[model samples]
Target: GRPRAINKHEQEQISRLLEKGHPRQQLAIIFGIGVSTLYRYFPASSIKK
Candidate 1:
Protein backbone atom coordinates (compact mmCIF):
# COMPACT_ATOMS: atom_id res chain seq x y z
CA GLY A 1 0.00 0.00 0.00
CA ARG A 2 1.08 3.58 -0.49
CA PRO A 3 2.16 5.68 2.46
CA ARG A 4 -0.61 6.90 4.68
CA ALA A 5 -0.72 10.67 4.48
CA ILE A 6 0.75 12.19 7.58
CA ASN A 7 -1.51 15.01 8.57
CA LYS A 8 -1.01 17.35 11.54
CA HIS A 9 -3.41 15.17 13.53
CA GLU A 10 -1.38 12.11 12.66
CA GLN A 11 1.81 13.77 13.80
CA GLU A 12 0.18 14.77 17.04
CA GLN A 13 -1.28 11.31 17.54
CA ILE A 14 2.03 9.64 16.76
CA SER A 15 3.92 11.87 19.15
CA ARG A 16 1.35 11.44 21.89
CA LEU A 17 1.24 7.68 21.47
CA LEU A 18 5.02 7.40 21.39
CA GLU A 19 5.15 9.22 24.71
CA LYS A 20 2.79 6.65 26.20
CA GLY A 21 5.15 3.73 25.36
CA HIS A 22 3.25 2.46 22.34
CA PRO A 23 5.32 0.06 20.25
CA ARG A 24 5.18 -0.37 16.49
CA GLN A 25 2.86 -3.37 16.79
CA GLN A 26 0.60 -1.54 19.19
CA LEU A 27 0.39 1.61 17.11
CA ALA A 28 -0.15 -0.42 13.97
CA ILE A 29 -3.18 -2.06 15.55
CA ILE A 30 -4.46 1.19 16.97
CA PHE A 31 -4.04 3.17 13.77
CA GLY A 32 -5.21 0.33 11.50
CA ILE A 33 -1.98 0.16 9.54
CA GLY A 34 0.88 -2.25 9.07
CA VAL A 35 3.89 -2.47 11.33
CA SER A 36 6.11 -2.08 8.28
CA THR A 37 4.23 1.09 7.44
CA LEU A 38 4.96 2.55 10.82
CA TYR A 39 8.62 1.78 10.36
CA ARG A 40 8.53 3.56 7.06
CA TYR A 41 7.24 6.70 8.71
CA PHE A 42 9.49 6.51 11.81
CA PRO A 43 12.34 4.09 11.55
CA ALA A 44 13.16 2.08 14.67
CA SER A 45 16.83 3.01 14.60
CA SER A 46 15.99 6.70 14.46
CA ILE A 47 13.30 6.39 17.11
CA LYS A 48 15.46 4.27 19.38
CA LYS A 49 18.53 6.43 19.06
Candidate 2:
Protein backbone atom coordinates (compact mmCIF):
# COMPACT_ATOMS: atom_id res chain seq x y z
CA GLY A 1 0.00 0.00 0.00
CA ARG A 2 1.05 3.57 -0.62
CA PRO A 3 1.94 5.88 2.23
CA ARG A 4 -0.59 8.50 3.26
CA ALA A 5 0.43 12.06 2.43
CA ILE A 6 -1.23 15.47 2.52
CA ASN A 7 -1.31 17.74 -0.49
CA LYS A 8 0.19 21.25 -0.73
CA HIS A 9 -3.25 22.87 -0.28
CA GLU A 10 -3.96 20.87 2.84
CA GLN A 11 -0.52 21.76 4.15
CA GLU A 12 -1.35 25.43 3.68
CA GLN A 13 -4.61 25.02 5.52
CA ILE A 14 -2.91 23.24 8.37
CA SER A 15 -0.34 26.03 8.54
CA ARG A 16 -3.15 28.56 8.77
CA LEU A 17 -4.83 26.57 11.51
CA LEU A 18 -1.57 26.34 13.39
CA GLU A 19 -1.16 30.08 13.12
CA LYS A 20 -4.64 30.38 14.66
CA GLY A 21 -3.27 28.63 17.80
CA HIS A 22 -4.96 25.29 17.30
CA PRO A 23 -3.50 22.51 19.42
CA ARG A 24 -1.44 19.90 17.58
CA GLN A 25 -3.35 17.05 19.14
CA GLN A 26 -6.71 18.49 18.17
CA LEU A 27 -5.50 19.24 14.66
CA ALA A 28 -4.34 15.64 14.38
CA ILE A 29 -7.86 14.43 15.14
CA ILE A 30 -9.51 16.95 12.85
CA PHE A 31 -7.10 16.04 10.06
CA GLY A 32 -7.73 12.32 10.62
CA ILE A 33 -4.04 11.61 11.21
CA GLY A 34 -1.94 10.57 14.16
CA VAL A 35 -0.07 13.08 16.27
CA SER A 36 3.16 11.49 15.10
CA THR A 37 2.16 12.01 11.51
CA LEU A 38 1.36 15.64 12.17
CA TYR A 39 4.74 16.20 13.71
CA ARG A 40 6.36 14.27 10.92
CA TYR A 41 4.93 16.69 8.39
CA PHE A 42 5.35 19.81 10.48
CA PRO A 43 8.25 19.65 12.86
CA ALA A 44 8.29 21.08 16.37
CA SER A 45 10.51 23.93 15.20
CA SER A 46 7.86 24.89 12.65
CA ILE A 47 5.28 25.37 15.40
CA LYS A 48 5.38 28.18 17.94
CA LYS A 49 6.69 27.28 21.34
Candidate 3:
Protein backbone atom coordinates (compact mmCIF):
# COMPACT_ATOMS: atom_id res chain seq x y z
CA GLY A 1 0.00 0.00 0.00
CA ARG A 2 1.19 3.51 -0.69
CA PRO A 3 1.53 6.12 2.03
CA ARG A 4 -1.69 6.91 3.85
CA ALA A 5 -3.53 10.04 2.75
CA ILE A 6 -3.74 11.45 6.22
CA ASN A 7 -0.51 12.56 7.88
CA LYS A 8 0.38 13.12 11.54
CA HIS A 9 -0.92 16.69 11.51
CA GLU A 10 -4.14 15.61 9.87
CA GLN A 11 -4.50 12.83 12.40
CA GLU A 12 -4.29 15.37 15.17
CA GLN A 13 -6.88 17.52 13.43
CA ILE A 14 -9.15 14.53 13.05
CA SER A 15 -8.79 13.72 16.72
CA ARG A 16 -9.73 17.24 17.62
CA LEU A 17 -12.78 17.08 15.36
CA LEU A 18 -13.76 13.74 16.90
CA GLU A 19 -13.49 15.22 20.37
CA LYS A 20 -15.69 18.08 19.27
CA GLY A 21 -18.47 15.60 18.37
CA HIS A 22 -18.08 15.76 14.60
CA PRO A 23 -19.84 12.94 12.77
CA ARG A 24 -17.54 10.29 11.28
CA GLN A 25 -19.29 10.31 7.93
CA GLN A 26 -18.93 14.06 7.54
CA LEU A 27 -15.37 13.99 8.72
CA ALA A 28 -14.52 11.35 6.14
CA ILE A 29 -15.82 13.54 3.31
CA ILE A 30 -14.17 16.63 4.70
CA PHE A 31 -10.85 14.85 4.91
CA GLY A 32 -11.22 13.40 1.41
CA ILE A 33 -11.23 9.82 2.67
CA GLY A 34 -13.67 6.99 3.21
CA VAL A 35 -15.46 6.26 6.44
CA SER A 36 -13.62 2.94 6.67
CA THR A 37 -10.28 4.68 6.36
CA LEU A 38 -11.29 7.09 9.12
CA TYR A 39 -11.99 4.16 11.42
CA ARG A 40 -8.70 2.51 10.48
CA TYR A 41 -6.84 5.57 11.72
CA PHE A 42 -9.11 6.38 14.62
CA PRO A 43 -10.99 3.38 15.84
CA ALA A 44 -14.49 4.08 17.13
CA SER A 45 -13.74 2.50 20.49
CA SER A 46 -10.56 4.53 20.84
CA ILE A 47 -12.31 7.83 20.09
CA LYS A 48 -13.67 9.87 23.00
CA LYS A 49 -17.27 9.03 23.67
Highest lDDT: give the candidate number.
3
Clashes of each: 0, 0, 0
Backbone clash pairs for candidate 2 read none
Candidate 1: list runs displaced more than 4 Å: 1-6
| CA lDDT of every candidate | 0.72, 0.81, 0.88
Model 3, 1-49: lDDT tens per residue? 7988888999999988988889989998888998998888888899866
For model 1, residues 1-49, the per-residue Cα lDDT tens digits are 9655576687668766766678878877777777887777777666654
**Which runs of model 2 end up more than 4 angstroms from their true locations?**
none
lDDT of 1 at 14: 79
TM-score per model over all chains: 0.63, 0.73, 0.85
Q: Name every residue pair that clashes in candidate 1.
A: none
Model 2 lDDT at residue 42: 82
Question: On a 0 to 100 scale, what is the lDDT of residue 49 in model 2?
Answer: 47
- Per-residue CA lDDT of model 2 for 1-49, tens digit only, reads 9876677887879878878888889988887878888888888788774
